[PDB]
């Protein structure tokens, strides 16, 4: 054996590639103009507390912006605050408050209805995208890293603009959204705050994924958007966990008043320079479905801030989930189904173990510990840090401090927000090689998750294991006005025989959707 | 209608692209050496307080570095500080203090003079570039996010190295620049600080835009740089707004002494491996011009920290701006023309509305509110967050706190620094399709800006609306020694008929300048 | 002279590149599965304090993950802590604690032994890579910015998860690694903390550089890993400099107990879709060598927090370093050879000057001041800020505060961690153009470094100037099982005549190694 001959190259700086008449060109520009925005009012008066069906109906010729936005404005009254609380860096909005407040939405484009679930869509998408991309969707794009929020915490998401490390990554007042706090009298136990939130609608077939440069829709003879409006305090208002309550009150009481809503769209004539618009335009419109869920009361007997190994290992196992084709990705999370406190972070469990069954293949990922489950999820787009994901004790030295008495340990204890595990069928390493993304092949799946919860010793709460699927799904816009959508399914043999793609395509006009 | 047939591909990791003799090559390197730096002294002794004309004159054969740097050193005495003030995280330099201190500069290259205005150039460029790119221009590249700077504020730009979230993005002591504080006696009301600032000169035709990998200049038989030196305390020294004054003093008094200045260049022989240097070398050298300005006294009757809707809507409208060709970009800002406090941030207004007239087309962008104006500016390179841009109350909870009395509300209130709106002619969405970037066509423009200011109720100040143009302008270096510069102008018909560019060029050597 | 004609293009958004059947394709996927992890125990019981030889021996067929990980777990008892110290944000691990604890490692692949020095490798690599890449190697990837760590410091690397600006970039508890603090009784002067660290092995031929997507090894009939285990407290445990000691104690006393260690690998069967594995696979496996070192006692007579110009200019000059070929990069650092405090940061000097001799060419880089040395090092991958690199006083206002008495100046004074200067032979700008990266040409090098140290006046310590080389070195895996490694050397004339590469290759499957 001998090493093979390797050819040589002489690297030199790009500065020596001299700009000349042979390699320089002057650009002019056309673009999507900003003189083209219009405000669409709903067909009837929106409910003053934001609870009820809301409908928009507006035909639009030519091009319509692919990421239309909903603009809500309202007053929130927060009661049962201890008298003369400063509330510095302690009040704000929850993450993606518009889409979190819409359990279901129906969009009609030229007689074709699209039914989707924005609250579910954004619940997954918020953990699975570039933060700067998410900041263009919502002014409240930052997601909670920890299960309790306190004023001093460094990345406290209710920090004001001047008190935040990055005001873009805060949901506090004086950050990305307009607000006004009503005057607070001395001795007052309540506060009124006006809000305005301009957020992109996360619902099929909108282009929330391509919010950087969204492909517009064309020639909408019929265009309706029907929302299940659930803009209730629990889906919007956030209060830090160290805000003190009035004596004899368990939780804060919040009321939404003066609720208004409009849809903001861009509408413009296509320029002649780009040429004739093609007969059939394709749009990436992912189908998210809850494949299975199951819950149980989880009772902690031992301290969650104590020895990590002695934390109560709660187990939930789904029923068999029948699927007629293979999704491109799955998402697993264990969350508190009925929250105790309405305005605190979403209580997710720290998943410490995961075993998966697919048809006859059993015990997949059984060997994996938290670090590898984090690595797995991160490799499929999970956008947060291990301190959050793990659900482990985040401030052990603060709690272990002997100055903190035994009765106040739990109060001081702050945990990571919890786990969301994204996995693809290729990660499973199935000996059945026909089980591949977008394969037209039926399968049965069962998911068991072992997890730890942040509740104190002698207390408990209900937790639900959820398994979602993210299927590749396209929407087709035909020249005659018709809209259709379908899954992109092929036989195992087609996909196995297809050409390899180890890199991006050299032709930059090409797009490779799904997988 | 039926969905079209789509071809399939099988994606696999880059790890499976095995390195072999067929796809591996070994590199060696040549580069711009670091043994090549020269210090050029000015022709005469520089003024000890940094006020006056400063001239460099140095012929240089072969290749000269495209981004030459000015290195200033001086002592600053700050007086009227309250006795025994700690000054922790409260003293530093303003952003780009070298270029901010040069209102005009003349560079001569082989008989061709280039006249530019560095203070204007950098005032725009600081808001319109990648932060890491800007950190290579100046050690004081961080721009103010808020109109008042206080010691506690999280991104306080006078935070010391150990107290900063990112010492690169601070302008404090113990960050990117050398300094020395003279010993402070107990009871002293003044402090002396030595500074040294090594900053790239932002003046045509220097390659401040391509600071990463600048294209060098060749064979400078004549090379002169003539600066209007205005290195005043007001253009350099920063003092936090919560530093307390001596009794009976309105503002701090600052004196510059021991001012020295040199120019740092790289000069080297071109390597033979890159081949013959081409006959004509092209350089990107943007032309920034103040197209129009107008000002007025703006009196606030209502509190700026009060109801945002009731903040005084000040209006300024430019005269008709005649232009013989169409610039690629415009910039609009409303700024305080005579500052009250000399060492505080530049007070910009929060622009809440913008009406633009171009020829017979009137009322463009009238529908746009702050979020969309921010989106517009950000899409054309604006590099700061909404909390800053908006000019809105940044710390509402701190101010609304009942512990803060009515007389101290204003003192506690901190606002966003204010708006800078970048827009292209394509953003306007004009009926007249001949109005395109780099079109050789005459136009008349008028700009009206509606804005709010940060001054208290019963006070006011003078604010000037400025409308800048950023024209595409190239500098040509001919083999015989001649330098020329010209705008890159073409007929509307030429530009309309040109080939479309939806993506970057596949050939990596190709540059596409302007647009 | 006249400007040349330049061709025009019309730029337009990527949204107008409509997705159609002509430019869209649907992907399916294969990937490196997560069902494939194995835990390998060592051949004998690991030493309970982590001191001794540790050997792994495990044959592995098919594909083995190119970046195998070592997982250490242990208990650390820290004694001599002042009674009832809170220890908030004051205890954690040093950077890369696994690899720092291994002075030498031998890896056997099918009879071919690779001897490397992980502690040296990571000492350089931690300063010379993308932080997000480094975070995948170790949970303690953040490197010290300053020579002293205090609790209040903004980027204090022992900040807990909830107290960190970025928990990924902290080495504190409740961040990237599992831990447990044993209960602390009132009046206790010691604390016991369990740790678990899962860290990639940095040793030839592992793919620690390509940690994102590592190329796996194949068909290991013999696979042994022999470690010089030096998992001692000084290489792992970190204690903040403002933690107070028990009366009559000079330093903290720490000992390791319950030490265990395993190796985590991925092992899987290559999928048939990628085709036949090529005969010879190439791996990038850089060779780092200590070319020369020299030391001396460095006594500071004047205050390091005083006038920067009056700080003692210590000089160290290496002996002549004979090398038979030209390395692609060099690294220079001046470090404290025997630390005074065992659990504080590594004390590096601030290098203010650097003279280099190569053969008959003397005084290279003699003109360069600290800003240019920082620029030089950063252009070759140095990943930290000037505040750190310079070694200058980081908190001058804090120290110059008259409230701080003359005797407490040094205690308050915090300095940048110090300099690491990376330079290539092309940076030197030698007359002798045959001295190029990977040239098979012998040379003699001498390096002189002028530097300042952070020790107080009337004290001193031993500092060693180290000069490392980073040679391009490839490992070849032959189909018959054989492994070889060699430097990639060519004649000067071969490299000079090779084709120019001003940009990346258009073919994305091509790799260009070294240079």
UniProtKB/TrEMBL annotation, chains A, B, C:
**Domain of life of the organism encoding this protein:** Viruses
Q: Where is the Major capsid protein V20 C-terminal domain?
A: 316-450
What is this protein identified as? Putative major capsid protein
Give the source species: Cafeteriavirus-dependent mavirus
- The shown residues of the full protein are 2 to 516 of 606
